Design a protein around this ligand. Structure first.
Ligand SMILES: CC(=O)NC1=C[C@H](O[C@@H]2O[C@H](CO)[C@@H](O[C@@H]3O[C@H](CO)[C@@H](O[C@@H]4O[C@H](CO)[C@@H](O)[C@H](O)[C@H]4NC(C)=O)[C@H](O)[C@H]3NC(C)=O)[C@H](O)[C@H]2NC(C)=O)[C@@H](CO)OC1=O
Length: 122
């Protein structure tokens, strides 16, 4: 995946959690479509710098999608006071700018750790 502050093992775990790390297309989630490898919504894609040729094109690319995650965490993680490890990055990915502080994402982190080789992933 793209390089950055998020580890490759963490990105792999998130990728597997969202789509079994496959280009699965989109689905509706609480008002907006989440797409591709990392199930990224348009707003997230905008916030990570509009990488790729378009939102859905980027989402369908493991590299572009992972770069978007890298940029999103560089933008919000430290700002929101998240631990700079997968626990914080995963929750930010699932809950937004301050996702690592939302109780809603506690379940996402716990479910993600159930994936082979993802328990306590950093
Ligand atoms: C069950 C489940 O959770 N499913 C999925 C969750 C997840 O999608 C994530 O969904 C959340 C909430 O809808 C997204 O959070 C929003 O993120 C926005 C983008 O950063 C953010 O909007 C920004 O907000 C800041 C602060 O106000 C502003 O300064 C920015 O200008 C603004 N940007 C824009 C372009 O509007 C917004 O406030 C968040 N909303 C809330 C309620 O927090 C989050 O981004 C989603 N994550 C992704 C990767 O898309 C995914 C994968 O887990 O899809 C799910 O199915």
């Amino acid at each position: 995946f793209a390089g950055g502050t998020v580890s490759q093992r963490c990105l792999s775990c998130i990728c597997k959690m969202e789509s079994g790390c496959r280009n699965v297309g989109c689905k509706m989630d609480m008002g907006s479509l989440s797409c591709g490898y990392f199930q990224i919504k348009e707003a997230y894609w905008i916030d990570c710098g509009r990488p790729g040729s378009s939102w859905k094109s980027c989402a369908a690319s493991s590299y572009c999608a992972s770069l978007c995650v890298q940029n999103y965490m560089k933008r919000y993680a430290k700002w929101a006071g998240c631990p700079l490890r997968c626990e914080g990055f995963a929750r930010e990915h699932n809950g937004g700018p301050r996702g690592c502080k939302k109780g809603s994402t506690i379940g996402y982190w716990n479910r993600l750790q159930k994936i082979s080789g993802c328990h306590g992933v950093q």
